[PDB]
Amino acid sequence: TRSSVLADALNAINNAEKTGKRQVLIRPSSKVIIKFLQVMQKHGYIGEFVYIDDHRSGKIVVQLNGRLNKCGVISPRFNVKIGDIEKWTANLLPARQFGYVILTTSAGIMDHEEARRKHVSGKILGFVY
Amino acid sequence: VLVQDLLHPTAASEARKHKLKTLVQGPRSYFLDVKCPGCLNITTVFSHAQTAVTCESCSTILCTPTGGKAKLSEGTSFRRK
Amino acid sequence: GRMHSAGKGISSSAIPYSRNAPAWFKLSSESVIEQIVKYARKGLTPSQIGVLLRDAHGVTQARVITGNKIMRILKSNGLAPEIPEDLYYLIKKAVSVRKHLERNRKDKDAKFRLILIESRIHRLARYYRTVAVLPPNWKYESATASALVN
Amino acid sequence: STELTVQSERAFQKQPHIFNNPKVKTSKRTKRWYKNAGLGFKTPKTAIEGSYIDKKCPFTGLVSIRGKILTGTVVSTKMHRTIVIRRAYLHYIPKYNRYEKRHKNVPVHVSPAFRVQVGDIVTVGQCRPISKTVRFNVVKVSAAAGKANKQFAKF
Amino acid sequence: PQAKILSQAPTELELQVAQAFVELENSSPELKAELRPLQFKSIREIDVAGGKKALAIFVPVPSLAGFHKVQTKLTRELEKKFQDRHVIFLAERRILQKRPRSRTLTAVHDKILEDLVFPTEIVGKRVRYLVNKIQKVLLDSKDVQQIDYKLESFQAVYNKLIVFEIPS
RNA sequence: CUAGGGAUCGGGUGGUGUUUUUUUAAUGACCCACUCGGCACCUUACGAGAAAUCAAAGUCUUUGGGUUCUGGGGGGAGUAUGG
RNA sequence: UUUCCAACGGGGCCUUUCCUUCUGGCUAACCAGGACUUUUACUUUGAAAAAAUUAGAGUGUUCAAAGCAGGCGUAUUGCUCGAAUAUAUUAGCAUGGAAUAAUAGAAUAGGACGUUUGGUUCUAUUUUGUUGGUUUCUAGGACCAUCGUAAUGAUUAAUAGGGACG
C-alpha cells in the first residue's frame, strides 16, 4: 500500500538522485504532491517539472540540476505553533542561513519562513534540499 | 534519459513491454470485424475470445476458446483495422 | 499483493485515455442499451451475460458505449439479483468445498480453504451492509452457504 | 407505556398553579403553559399541542438553560425519559506531541416531546441538578438518518 | 437575427450569414426535421489576430446527439458565405444552497475541452511548470478533418474559461 | 528503485527463420527477441555493518512509507512464586 | 522632497473567478432585516491566567548578595524622579484562516433555480366602532393534482483487492 503517496514520492527521487538520475516517473501523484513540487520548483532546489496525465493517478517528470541532496516526509504530520517551527529548524536543518522545512496550512502550502512572513504556522510536511 | 523528456524518447522501445509499464497505458490486443462462411454477416468476436461462436445461420461452432487468444474455425476473411 | 493467498498477480483489464466511442463502432447508445436489455431478460448472472454477449456481438463493455452499468441496468428492469454476482459465486465455492467436506472427513486443506472463502464472504457481507445493498438483519451463515446457490 | 391522560403515577401530573377553569366552559379548551427555552431554540410542536407534563422539560416544566451546551450521539435509551450521550475527543500528550482517543458518558434527561433512537445526534443544555448524574436536558434533536421512509422503493 | 427555426431564444446576430436559420427548412427533406427543433443561446465573436473572429455559438446540451452527424458538414457551410470568420459550437455545463461534486468548476470545461473539434478524442494533459503556465495537453487521432488546421484560433479559445500541437 | 547476466520453469508470440515431415518455420523443438510467475546464482559494493558478509542484514546523525511482538552487563535464571 | 529603468505586497474590478439575494436611512459608504459557496479535527489574533520565584532598565546598599530605593540647589523654610515588561500549552470562551484529515448531499430526482397555479395548517399588527362568540381578502413557512427551470444527479476502474469464464 502507498499510505502516503507523498512518501512514495521523493524516496523514489532519493532512489533516483542517490543512484544518479536526472528524472523519475512518479505514479501515483496528487495535488498534495503537485503543489509540493511547485513549492520546490519555486525554491529551485529541483528544476523544471511537468505533470503528464491519464484517466488514472498521473505522472510527473522532473528536470533538476543536482541540488536536491535529500528530502523526506516528516510523517506523522505534526501540528506546529508559531514559536515551535524554530524548534523543528535546529533539529533537522543544515545551517541557519538556508534550508527549508515546508508546511501544509490553512493558507495552503509554503515553507516555514513564509509561514513566519505571512504569520501562521500549520501542519508539517517535509524537509527539502 | 541524459537530456530528453519522456515525452521525447525512442518511442517503440517500451511499446511491447507489458501494456501498463509503458509511458501511458495502452491495451495489447485488437478488434476484428469478420464474416462467417455461413452467412457473410460481419460477426465481431473478440481476439482473446472466451465464447464458442455458434453461427448466425448454421449451428456450427466456428471457434474454439484457448488462453492467450482463441482458436477460430478456418474460413474467416480478415482485413485491416 | 493478494489477501489470503501469499502470491503476486496481474489479471489485466487496462483502459487507455479516451472515454467516448473512438473510431469505428457504428451503433447508437440506444442500440447497445437495448442489446443489453435483450441480454438481461435471459435470466442469468451478470458475469454470464458479459462473458458471452460482450464477446459475440461486438459489444465493447457495458459502460463505454452503453452508459449505464449492469447492476444499474437490472434494477431499472425488475430483474435485479438477490445477492449480486460475486458473493453468490463465493457461496458457490463454499458449496463445492462443503460438499467435498463430507465426501471425505479428513481433507485438512479443505478446512483451510473454507476459512479463506468464509472470511471473504464476511467482508463482502459487511461491505454490502455498509452501503446498504444487503439488508443488515440477515447474517451470512454456513447453514445458508449450501442451500442458497443449489 | 405512560398512556396520555398521563396520570399513571399515584399523583396527578399537571402544570403547577395552572388552573383549568371549571365554572366557565367556553371555546378555550386548552390551558397549557409553555415557555421559550432561550438561546434561539425552536420549541417542539408536541410541547405546544401535547398532554404530557414532564416537570423537567425545558419547554413546559420548571427547569432552565444556562452556561453549557453539548453535542454528541445517543446511546442506551433503555431508561425512562432520559438518554446517555457519549462525547469522543482527543486528549493531548506533549511527551510524544500526539493525541489519544477518549470518550465521556453524559447522562442527560430527554423530553417526551422529542422521540429518539440509539445513534442519533443530540444537543443538550445545562440545567439545575436533576439527579446524581444528570445536569443536562435534551433540547435539540438533529437526527441525520438519511430519509429511509420509502428509499428501499428504489429505481 | 430574427426569423424562424429556433424556439425563440434570440441574439442580435443570427441572420446575416445563416440561411441555415431561414432556408435549410427549404432545401432539406429530413435535415428539416433535424435543424428546426434545435436552439442556441447566444453568439459571441472573438478576435484572434488577423481580424479573425470565432463565433462561440452557445448551443444547449440537448442538441449534440444528432448534431454530431451534421457538424461534419455545417462548420464549412458558413465558410461558404462569410470567410475569415469562424464557427465553433459550444455547450453549457453545470457548475457544482446544496451543490454536488461530480462536474464542479473545471469539469464544467472538461467537456468544453474536447468540443472544439470532432470526432477524434483525447490522449491527455502534459502540463508544464515554468514552461500551469503554458499547459500542454495532447490528443491521439484516427483522422484529420477539423483538427490540425483551424487550431490556431482554438489556442485563443479555451484557456480563459487539448492544446493545439498534435503529432497526428 | 537500482543493479548485471546466461539459464531455468508456468504462460503468451511467430521472423521471405533452420531441419524428420501436415507440406521451408508441423506433433514437439529450435537461433534471434519479448512479456509477466517461482527457484537460484555471481560481479563491482553506490549503501551499509565492528566484522564474517549482505542487491538487501539498503534509500538511518543528510536520522519519520504503514503496522505487530520482543531486548537492556554477566550470571543467579527461564530459577522461585503466582495466574 | 521634482523623480526615468525594474523589483518585493494585498485590495476596487475584470478575461463563466457568485464577489449573492435584502431594502427605510439612499439615490450598499455603512447600519436592522431571510439563506450562507455544509459540521468536527487544525491553526491564527484577544481574554483569563494571584502576589512571591525566573529575565531586565534605573538606583555608588562604598562594589555587591541584597533593596525598590530616591536625587537637587539661594537649604531663604523648599523643589522633585519612581516603584516597568517578558512569560505560563491542553480544558473552557470569542473570529478569520481556507490546505490537511474527516463527514457527503442531487440516483427516487418522493430535490434544487419554482420569481408557478387549484387545494391543506393557517391567520389579526390590524383597519373593523370602544373591548370578547361570526368571518374574509390577507404579512410568513410546507406538499399532493401539476408543469413552465438553467448548464437538471452516476469524480475513477488502481503497476490495491473480490467474482466469472478461458
Nearest in space to D69 (alpha carbons), one of D54, D92, D90, D85: D85
Residue C36 grid coordinates: 443489453
Contact B24/A at CB under 8 A: yes
Task: For residues C136 and C125, give the distance between their C-alpha atoms in angstroms, rounded to a whole number.
Answer: 9
List the chains bordering chain D where 3 or more Cβ pairs fall under 8 Å: C
Q: Verify E-D touch: 3 or more CB pairs within 8 A.
A: no
Beta-ladder partners of E53: E47, E85
Alpha carbon distance A84, A110 (integer Å): 16
Nucleic acid strand G within 7 Å of E142 CB: no
DSSP element (H, E) containing D101: strand D98-109
- Quote the distance between the C-alpha of residue A62 and its chain's center: 13
Torsion of CA C60, C61, C63, C69, to 10 degrees: 150
Angle, in degrees to the nearest 10, between helices C46-53 and C29-40:
130
| Lookup: cell for E165 | 500541437
Domains of chain C from N-terminus onward: 26-80 (no CATH), 81-150 (1.10.287.10)
Residues D125, D37: Cα–Cα separation, whole Å: 10
Three cell numbers, residue C89:
459465486
Partnered with residue A126 across adjacent β-strands are: A73, A102
Alpha carbons within 13 angstroms on the beta-carbon side of residue D139 total 29
DSSP letter for A85, please.
H
Task: Measure CA D82 to chain center.
Answer: 8
| CB of A16 closer than 8 Å to CB of A69 | no
AA identity, residue C143: A
Which of A45, A68, A91 is the last residue in one of the domains?
Answer: A68
How far the first Cα of chain E sits from its last, in Å, is 39
Return all residues near E50 (Cβ < 8 A) that are at least 6 apart: E84
Give which of C90, C73, C93 is closest to C81, Cα–Cα. Answer: C73
Using the Cα atoms of residue D136, residue D138, residue D140 and residue D145 in order, give the sign of their dihedral: positive
Q: How many CA atoms lie within 13 A of E64 on its CB side?
A: 19
Q: How far apart are CA D80 and CA D64, in angstroms?
A: 20
Pairing of β E85-90 and β E52-58 = parallel
Task: Please give the angle made by the CA atoms of B60, B62 and B66, to the nearest 5 degrees.
Answer: 135
Cell readout for D35 is 415557555
CA gap D30, D20 in Å, rounded: 8
Residues A94, A124, single domain; the answer is yes
CATH number at residue D8: 2.40.50.1000
Neighbors of chain A with 3 or more C-beta pairs under 8 Å:
B, C, E
| Alpha-carbon span C101 to A86, nearest angstrom | 66
How many angstroms is C1' of F57 away from CA of A41?
A: 37
Question: In angstroms, rounded to a whole number, what is the distance separating the alpha carbons of residues E115 and E109?
Answer: 9
Long-range contact set of residues E2-6: C-beta below 8 Å, sequence gap at least 24:
E5/E35, E5/E36, E5/E38, E6/E38, E6/E39, E6/E40
Alpha-carbon distance of C127 to C134, in angstroms, equals: 9
- Sequence letter at residue E153: S
- How many other CB atoms are found less than 10 A from the CB of residue D127? 21
Subunit contact B24:E126, Cβ cutoff 8 A:
no
Nucleotide minimizing C1' to CA distance for residue C52:
G165
Cα–Cα distances in angstroms (integers) from residue C132 to residues B23, C69, C124, D73, in the given order = 40, 19, 12, 21
CB B33 within 8 Å of CB B45: no
Q: Which residues of B7-35 are buried (b: 16+ CB within 10 A; e: fewer)?
A: eeeeeeeeeeeebeeebbeeeeeeebeeb
Nearest nucleotide relative to B48: CA against C1': G166
Is the CB of B31 inside 8 Å of chain C's CB atoms?
yes
Provide the number of CB pairs (under 8 Å) joining chain C to chain E: 18
Peptide bond into E119 cis (omega under 30): yes
Type of residue found at E59: V
The stretches of chain A forming alpha helices (DSSP H) are: 11-17, 31-43, 85-91, 112-117
E-strand stretches of E11-147: 43-48, 52-58, 85-90, 124-129, 137-138
Q: Is the dihedral of CA D133, D138, D139, D142 positive or negative?
A: positive
Mark whether A60 and A106 lie in a shared domain.
Answer: no
* CA distances, D7 to each of B2, C20, D1, E26, E101 (Å): 91, 71, 11, 85, 53
Q: Where are the alpha helices (DSSP H) in chain C?
A: 29-40, 46-53, 70-75, 86-101, 108-130
Residue B5 CB neighbour total at 10 angstroms: 14
Same domain, A73 and A58: no
What's A115's domain CATH number? 3.30.1490.10
Residue E32 domain boundaries: 1-168
C4 Rama sector, left if φ>0, alpha if ψ -120 to 50, beta otherwise: left
What does the alpha-carbon distance between residue B32 and residue B81 come to, in Å, rounded to a whole number? 7
Contact A48, E129 (CB under 8 A): yes
The H or E element spanning position B34 is: strand B34-35
CA distances from B55 to C82, E79, E103 (A): 34, 49, 45
Domain count, chain E: 1
State the number of CA atoms in the 13 A half-sphere of B9 facing the CB.
Answer: 12
Q: How far is CA C109 from the centre of its chain?
A: 26
Chain B positions touching C15 (Cβ under 8 A) are 25, 27
Residues in D 17-46 whose C-beta is less than 7 A from nucleic strand G are 27
How far is the C-alpha of C27 from the C-alpha of C58, rounded, in Å? Answer: 10
Total structural domains within chain D: 1
List % helix, strand, coil for chain B (3-state, nearest 5): 10, 10, 80
Residue ranges per structural domain of chain B: 1-81
Domain membership of residue D78 as a residue range: 1-155
Q: What is the CATH number of domain B1-81?
A: 2.20.25.100
Residues A45 and A73 in one domain: no
Decide: CB of C1 under 7 A of nucleic strand F.
no
Experiment used for this model: cryo-EM
Question: Can you say whether residue C46 is alpha, beta or left, with left for phi > 0 and alpha for psi between -120 and 50 degrees?
Answer: alpha
- C75: helix, coil or strand? helix
Phi, psi values for residue C84, rounded to 5°: -60, -70
Q: Final residue of a domain: which of A23, A44, A68?
A: A68
| Distance from C-alpha of D154 to C-alpha of C36, rounded to nearest angstrom | 21
Gap between the Cα atoms of A102 and A33, Å rounded: 12
Report the sign of the C-alpha dihedral through residues A107, A111, A117, A121, in that order.
positive
Name every chain C residue with its beta carbon within 8 A of the beta carbon of A55. Answer: 15, 17, 19
Contact A77, A104 (CB under 8 A): yes
E 20-49, residues with C-beta < 7 Å of strand G: 41
Name the residue range of residue A17's domain.
1-68
How many distinct structural domains can be found in chain A? 2
- CA dist., res. D126 & res. D140, Å (int): 13
Distance of C1' in G27 from CA in E46, Å = 37
Same domain, A89 and A44: no
Helix ranges, E6-118 (H): 32-35, 68-74
Instruction: Give dist(CA C116, CA C38) in Å, integer.
Output: 37
Given a contact cutoff of 8 angstroms between Cβ atoms, the answer to whether B53 and B62 are in contact is yes
End-to-end CA, chain A: 27
Bases of chain G below 7 A from a protein C-beta are: 10, 15-17, 35-37, 41-45, 89-91, 96-101, 105-113, 133-134, 150-166
Q: D142, D123, D114, D125: which is closest to D47 by C-alpha? A: D114
